[PDB]
Amino acid sequence: MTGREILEKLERREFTREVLKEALSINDRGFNEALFKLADEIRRKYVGDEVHIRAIIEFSNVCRKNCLYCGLRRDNKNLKRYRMTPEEIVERARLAVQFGAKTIVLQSGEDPYXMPDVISDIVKEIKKMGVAVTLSLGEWPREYYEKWKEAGADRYLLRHETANPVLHRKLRPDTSFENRLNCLLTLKELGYETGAGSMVGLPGQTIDDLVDDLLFLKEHDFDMVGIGPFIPHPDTPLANEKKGDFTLTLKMVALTRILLPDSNIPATTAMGTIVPGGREITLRCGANVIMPNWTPSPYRQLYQLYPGKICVFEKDTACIPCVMKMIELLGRKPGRDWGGRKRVFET
Ligand SMILES: C[C@H](CCC(=O)NCCC[N+](C)(C)CCCS(=O)(=O)[O-])[C@H]1CC[C@H]2[C@@H]3[C@H](O)C[C@@H]4C[C@H](O)CC[C@]4(C)[C@H]3C[C@H](O)[C@]12C
Ligand SMILES: C[C@H]1O[C@@H](n2cnc3c(N)ncnc32)[C@H](O)[C@@H]1O
Ligand code: MET
Ligand code: SF4
Ligand SMILES: [Cl-]
Ligand SMILES: [Cl-]
Ligand SMILES: [Cl-]
């Protein structure tokens, strides 16, 4: 199919493997710009001009897993490990709510210390503030997920990483794609708004793999989808591999919006790390969420999944104001409510 024909099929919602493969394979500037415009327009029509702010607190960099891409992997001895106290986390969340955050995201390595009861206690305290709570804590027993839902958690982010089971197992040697999917299905069954997503440009990953990621996301109809480029970290086995391509990653975000028009899709910090102004571009190519860093010093600089974190030198309270300025200069509006998914049922 020609570029024009692929665009027409996307507009008619003929989302075949063949159409998706061709969209990711064509490198023509004209085609790409038309794809981005289509995603931007679909975003505006379905989810409007509000950009939802999710304040993220990265509360522990301790991890029991050994994912090959991740700077927090357990084999990395070149890292000072930290744990925020429950009181520090709650009060940091309170400060974010004081600054206008309507969702608090708690993210960590897979750190056994907190699990499950300390998390439950923290979630309960933050829910009293009248905001949404999102957890992003990795893979845990169903019972832990159940306890956290009962404690009042609203959403769970668990990127599927890669839908190729062979590549998944190689990159995530403690676990499997089967496990990851089972966790995502459990989260959905328990009533969480559930987020998946993937990295683009992983070593060994192919275009067909990216197509499979898109089809996987469409199959399971996730509420949120987080996508970013792979960025090699020097203290990992993938230190010498190539970074993911920004434009290809942007096309994945655009296609995700086209496939899942009413989903919540962040402009991830990795997009802003690989290219100056990358988040702002992504917000104009299908994304409608932004996640300003709210991890305080001295811990922020110790939570580097990949190097070059854009907020690392900024003050503790800088990032919420910074994204509000961003939203205004983009001609957009901040979210007025918790920014939960607003499903538009269609055919
Ligand atoms: C935290 C401190 C002290 C007072 C306090 O503890 N304030 C709680 C407010 C709680 N809310 C955010 C829910 C109010 C919503 C009111 S609103 O009318 O916006 O719906 C207050 C005093 C002045 C406030 C800033 C300025 O204003 C400018 C700006 C407005 C944006 O918008 C949000 C960001 C920002 C930077 C503000 C953040 C924060 O807030 C500040 C620092
Ligand atoms: C929180 C999310 O961050 C992503 N993540 C972890 N390590 C890297 C890296 N080196 N490069 C880019 N993204 C990464 C994973 O996709 C994880 O799910
Ligand atoms: C810090 S990585 C993101 C949170 C969790 N460890 C996961 O891998 O899903
Ligand atoms: S990606 Fe999440 S589980 Fe894997 S090593 Fe990093 S922090 Fe641990
Ligand atoms: Cl969220
Ligand atoms: Cl995300
Ligand atoms: Cl990211």
XYZ file of C-alpha atoms and ligand atoms in Angstrom:
427
model
C 0.000 0.000 0.000
C 1.119 3.585 -0.664
C 1.421 6.141 2.139
C -1.881 7.697 1.102
C -3.538 4.271 1.072
C -2.218 3.390 4.557
C -3.542 6.684 5.940
C -6.938 6.050 4.367
C -7.105 2.568 5.875
C -6.149 4.005 9.297
C -8.883 6.654 8.944
C -11.398 3.909 8.033
C -10.112 1.853 11.006
C -8.902 -1.099 8.962
C -6.350 -2.056 11.601
C -4.810 -5.096 9.996
C -1.338 -6.402 10.787
C -0.433 -5.472 7.232
C -1.553 -1.835 7.590
C 0.341 -1.432 10.898
C 3.511 -3.025 9.508
C 3.460 -0.724 6.489
C 2.884 2.366 8.667
C 5.946 1.540 10.769
C 8.026 0.586 7.717
C 7.467 3.737 5.591
C 10.026 6.487 6.376
C 8.680 9.207 4.110
C 8.492 12.632 5.870
C 5.124 13.456 4.299
C 3.587 10.202 5.467
C 4.965 10.578 8.986
C 3.691 14.142 9.341
C 0.242 13.069 8.128
C 0.245 10.168 10.610
C 1.159 12.554 13.444
C -1.563 15.017 12.378
C -4.123 12.213 12.300
C -3.180 11.068 15.804
C -3.238 14.656 17.103
C -6.702 15.161 15.627
C -8.014 11.873 17.040
C -6.613 12.867 20.437
C -8.358 16.224 20.297
C -11.679 14.735 19.185
C -11.814 11.933 21.749
C -9.953 13.219 24.828
C -9.915 16.951 24.236
C -7.289 19.564 25.091
C -6.875 18.698 28.792
C -3.432 17.347 29.632
C -3.659 15.303 32.822
C -0.898 15.765 35.353
C 0.221 12.684 37.301
C 2.790 13.542 40.010
C 5.241 10.653 40.365
C 7.066 9.812 43.581
C 9.817 7.243 43.048
C 9.958 6.174 46.651
C 12.504 3.348 46.651
C 15.219 2.276 44.160
C 15.637 -1.160 45.808
C 14.845 -4.006 43.441
C 14.882 -7.794 43.653
C 14.719 -8.246 39.855
C 17.554 -8.098 37.331
C 16.037 -6.737 34.090
C 18.889 -6.313 31.633
C 17.898 -2.761 30.529
C 17.302 -1.202 33.958
C 19.700 0.863 36.024
C 18.019 -0.375 39.264
C 18.664 -4.052 38.463
C 19.808 -5.987 41.530
C 23.270 -6.739 40.107
C 24.084 -3.030 39.858
C 26.447 -2.382 42.777
C 27.337 1.119 41.418
C 24.241 2.657 43.018
C 23.389 4.031 46.432
C 20.073 2.438 47.404
C 17.412 4.440 49.266
C 13.984 4.010 50.785
C 11.668 6.895 51.664
C 9.795 6.466 54.949
C 6.001 6.116 54.796
C 5.710 9.522 56.496
C 8.029 11.118 53.923
C 6.000 9.586 51.074
C 2.638 10.718 52.454
C 3.879 14.240 53.128
C 5.511 14.438 49.705
C 2.173 13.358 48.161
C 0.419 16.040 50.256
C 2.778 18.673 48.852
C 1.935 17.536 45.301
C -1.787 17.809 46.038
C -1.132 21.290 47.474
C 0.536 22.095 44.141
C -2.548 20.917 42.237
C -1.824 17.276 41.378
C -5.038 15.305 40.979
C -3.289 11.897 40.624
C -0.363 10.656 42.714
C 1.754 7.900 41.148
C 3.824 5.775 43.527
C 6.606 3.916 41.730
C 9.483 1.837 42.980
C 11.776 -1.027 42.235
C 10.332 -4.344 43.361
C 11.288 -3.647 46.976
C 9.977 -6.292 49.382
C 10.159 -3.976 52.448
C 6.884 -2.196 51.747
C 4.844 -5.147 50.497
C 1.925 -5.307 51.007
C 1.006 -3.524 54.255
C 3.153 -0.400 54.201
C 1.842 0.372 50.696
C -1.724 -0.149 51.926
C -1.181 2.267 54.801
C 0.325 4.914 52.464
C -2.477 4.522 49.898
C -5.115 4.974 52.611
C -3.515 8.186 53.831
C -3.148 9.679 50.343
C -6.735 8.740 49.368
C -7.940 10.960 52.263
C -6.612 13.917 50.178
C -9.330 13.333 47.531
C -7.064 12.438 44.617
C -6.524 9.401 42.431
C -3.765 6.987 43.377
C -1.811 5.004 40.832
C 0.638 2.258 41.788
C 3.574 1.108 39.710
C 5.320 -1.480 41.883
C 5.937 -4.387 39.507
C 4.809 -8.035 39.755
C 3.315 -9.241 43.047
C 0.811 -11.871 44.167
C -2.883 -11.363 43.424
C -3.414 -11.010 47.152
C -1.205 -7.899 47.298
C -3.055 -6.321 44.361
C -6.342 -7.118 46.112
C -5.200 -5.516 49.372
C -4.058 -2.360 47.524
C -7.402 -2.101 45.696
C -9.242 -2.437 49.007
C -6.946 0.257 50.458
C -8.267 2.558 47.723
C -5.760 2.431 44.811
C -7.403 3.453 41.543
C -4.906 2.561 38.845
C -1.897 0.326 38.218
C 0.861 0.822 35.688
C 2.621 -2.360 34.554
C 4.206 -1.911 31.131
C 4.220 -5.186 29.210
C 7.723 -4.136 27.969
C 7.705 -6.398 24.905
C 5.016 -8.771 23.639
C 7.635 -11.111 22.139
C 7.842 -13.847 24.783
C 11.317 -14.905 23.814
C 12.770 -11.408 23.964
C 10.807 -10.744 27.185
C 12.341 -13.730 28.961
C 15.867 -12.831 27.825
C 15.529 -9.238 28.998
C 13.613 -10.043 32.197
C 15.248 -13.272 33.387
C 13.345 -13.473 36.699
C 9.995 -13.699 34.980
C 8.113 -14.046 31.666
C 5.656 -12.434 29.320
C 3.117 -15.045 30.472
C 3.573 -13.785 34.052
C 3.379 -10.144 32.992
C 0.167 -10.700 31.075
C -1.358 -12.669 33.948
C -0.590 -9.716 36.281
C -2.228 -7.276 33.824
C -5.319 -9.523 33.517
C -5.525 -9.829 37.332
C -5.283 -6.054 37.703
C -8.126 -5.564 35.215
C -10.257 -8.245 36.924
C -9.805 -6.484 40.264
C -11.163 -3.247 38.787
C -8.007 -1.185 38.406
C -7.651 1.204 35.531
C -4.736 -0.673 34.028
C -1.746 0.608 32.099
C 0.521 -1.374 29.789
C 3.039 -0.275 27.158
C 6.474 -1.018 25.880
C 9.939 0.118 25.030
C 10.943 0.794 21.434
C 14.374 -0.065 20.047
C 15.281 -2.809 22.506
C 18.234 -4.929 21.383
C 16.857 -7.761 19.240
C 13.456 -6.144 18.756
C 12.081 -6.033 15.211
C 9.415 -4.034 13.383
C 7.178 -7.107 13.479
C 7.641 -7.090 17.267
C 6.396 -3.489 17.358
C 3.350 -4.510 15.304
C 2.696 -7.271 17.838
C 2.931 -4.696 20.662
C 0.283 -2.557 18.932
C -2.007 -5.559 18.362
C -1.548 -6.654 21.982
C -2.544 -3.210 23.251
C -5.597 -3.153 20.979
C -6.593 -6.701 22.001
C -6.673 -5.911 25.709
C -8.052 -2.380 25.436
C -5.841 -0.880 28.142
C -6.864 2.298 29.933
C -3.342 3.695 29.726
C -0.399 3.031 27.478
C 3.139 4.124 28.309
C 5.670 4.064 25.498
C 9.246 5.258 25.360
C 12.529 4.552 23.625
C 15.076 2.193 25.079
C 17.994 4.225 26.489
C 21.155 2.188 27.346
C 22.391 2.497 30.928
C 26.133 2.210 31.556
C 25.787 0.013 34.658
C 23.836 -2.708 32.818
C 24.542 -5.536 30.339
C 22.994 -3.435 27.556
C 25.383 -0.468 28.079
C 26.834 -0.683 24.568
C 23.598 -1.203 22.645
C 21.933 1.411 20.452
C 19.285 3.785 21.804
C 15.777 3.576 20.416
C 14.850 5.905 17.603
C 12.737 8.887 18.615
C 10.712 9.098 15.391
C 9.871 5.398 15.409
C 8.827 5.676 19.070
C 6.682 8.706 18.197
C 4.974 6.657 15.475
C 4.181 3.997 18.080
C 2.532 6.657 20.268
C 0.604 8.016 17.255
C -0.595 4.551 16.216
C -1.569 3.734 19.809
C -3.817 6.827 19.863
C -5.336 5.849 16.495
C -6.007 2.285 17.759
C -7.163 3.257 21.246
C -8.687 6.680 20.717
C -10.137 7.139 24.207
C -7.095 5.927 26.130
C -4.771 7.891 28.371
C -1.307 8.096 26.809
C 1.610 9.863 28.513
C 4.400 11.858 26.873
C 7.005 9.900 28.781
C 10.105 11.366 30.340
C 12.282 9.083 28.181
C 10.937 10.948 25.135
C 12.218 14.186 26.663
C 15.575 12.600 27.484
C 16.356 11.319 23.978
C 15.407 14.584 22.230
C 15.228 18.079 23.707
C 11.553 18.992 23.739
C 10.545 15.382 23.094
C 7.633 15.409 25.570
C 6.096 18.477 23.947
C 6.347 16.843 20.504
C 4.732 13.690 21.859
C 1.834 15.693 23.365
C 1.166 16.934 19.832
C 1.289 13.459 18.223
C -1.323 11.641 20.331
C -0.393 11.921 24.003
C -2.612 13.597 26.606
C -0.890 12.916 29.948
C 2.317 14.149 31.547
C 4.075 12.825 34.656
C 6.182 15.504 36.353
C 8.773 14.172 38.733
C 7.966 14.736 42.403
C 10.744 12.636 43.941
C 12.648 14.827 46.385
C 16.377 15.347 46.699
C 18.571 13.576 47.635
C 16.742 10.583 46.140
C 15.684 11.876 42.712
C 19.226 11.575 41.358
C 19.474 7.968 42.597
C 16.484 6.757 40.550
C 17.844 6.595 37.042
C 16.424 3.668 35.118
C 18.297 5.195 32.188
C 20.846 8.046 32.211
C 20.128 11.686 31.383
C 16.939 12.102 33.505
C 15.720 15.632 32.601
C 14.527 16.717 36.061
C 17.573 15.578 38.024
C 19.131 19.026 38.504
C 15.827 20.786 39.139
C 14.467 21.765 42.573
C 12.063 19.497 44.462
C 8.988 21.506 43.522
C 9.995 22.587 39.972
C 8.309 20.020 37.791
C 4.609 20.648 38.470
C 4.982 24.377 37.657
C 7.141 23.510 34.663
C 4.508 21.189 33.136
C 1.780 23.763 33.769
C 3.796 26.297 31.772
C 4.310 23.593 29.120
C 0.597 22.871 28.887
C -0.157 26.600 28.450
C 2.512 27.210 25.762
C 1.156 24.181 23.880
C -2.296 25.820 23.832
C -3.732 23.089 26.043
C -5.480 23.050 29.484
C -4.675 21.194 32.725
C -7.025 18.399 33.689
C -9.942 19.536 35.844
C -10.807 16.190 37.463
C -8.834 12.993 38.129
C -8.501 12.296 34.380
C -9.837 8.760 34.532
C -10.572 7.096 31.224
C -13.797 8.400 29.622
C -14.797 5.575 27.330
C -16.463 6.444 24.061
C -18.302 3.291 22.987
C -18.314 2.839 19.257
C -18.534 0.251 16.476
C 1.152 25.209 48.418
C 1.266 26.729 48.506
C 0.639 27.232 49.821
C -0.885 27.228 49.913
C -1.538 25.864 49.807
O -1.287 24.961 50.604
N -2.432 25.744 48.844
C -3.196 24.533 48.612
C -3.948 24.702 47.290
C -4.702 23.423 46.923
N -5.222 23.399 45.536
C -4.146 23.295 44.537
C -6.034 22.158 45.456
C -5.998 24.631 45.276
C -6.737 24.631 43.934
C -7.284 26.052 43.741
S -7.849 26.333 42.203
O -8.564 27.632 42.231
O -6.689 26.370 41.295
O -8.781 25.235 41.886
C 0.723 27.463 47.279
C 0.882 28.998 47.396
C 0.956 29.521 45.950
C 0.695 28.303 45.081
C 1.163 28.371 43.623
C 0.591 29.595 42.899
O -0.835 29.676 43.069
C 0.928 29.557 41.405
C 0.677 28.212 40.713
C -0.831 28.032 40.446
C -1.152 26.703 39.757
O -2.570 26.569 39.549
C -0.609 25.549 40.599
C 0.897 25.721 40.741
C 1.311 27.019 41.448
C 2.831 27.142 41.414
C 0.825 27.049 42.920
C 1.291 25.816 43.725
C 0.858 25.867 45.199
O -0.573 25.672 45.280
C 1.299 27.160 45.890
C 2.829 27.220 45.952
C 8.991 2.463 34.258
C 9.333 1.940 32.873
O 10.587 2.509 32.520
C 11.074 1.765 31.442
N 12.537 1.628 31.461
C 13.310 0.888 32.326
N 14.599 0.953 31.935
C 14.659 1.705 30.787
C 15.682 2.109 29.949
N 16.951 1.723 30.125
N 15.384 2.879 28.864
C 14.094 3.317 28.652
N 13.072 2.946 29.468
C 13.356 2.148 30.516
C 10.368 0.392 31.472
O 9.545 0.307 30.324
C 9.576 0.440 32.760
O 8.351 -0.270 32.741
C 11.081 1.172 38.134
S 10.562 0.097 36.782
C 8.790 0.352 36.941
C 8.177 -0.231 38.194
C 8.295 -1.743 38.335
N 9.618 -2.095 38.913
C 8.201 -2.381 36.955
O 9.229 -2.822 36.394
O 7.082 -2.465 36.386
S 12.409 -2.516 35.359
Fe 11.226 -2.420 37.387
S 11.496 -4.762 38.023
Fe 13.016 -4.530 36.327
S 15.039 -4.130 37.407
Fe 14.047 -2.081 36.938
S 12.927 -1.527 38.808
Fe 13.377 -3.766 38.915
Cl -2.184 7.503 36.120
Cl 4.172 5.714 31.714
Cl 9.978 7.130 30.765
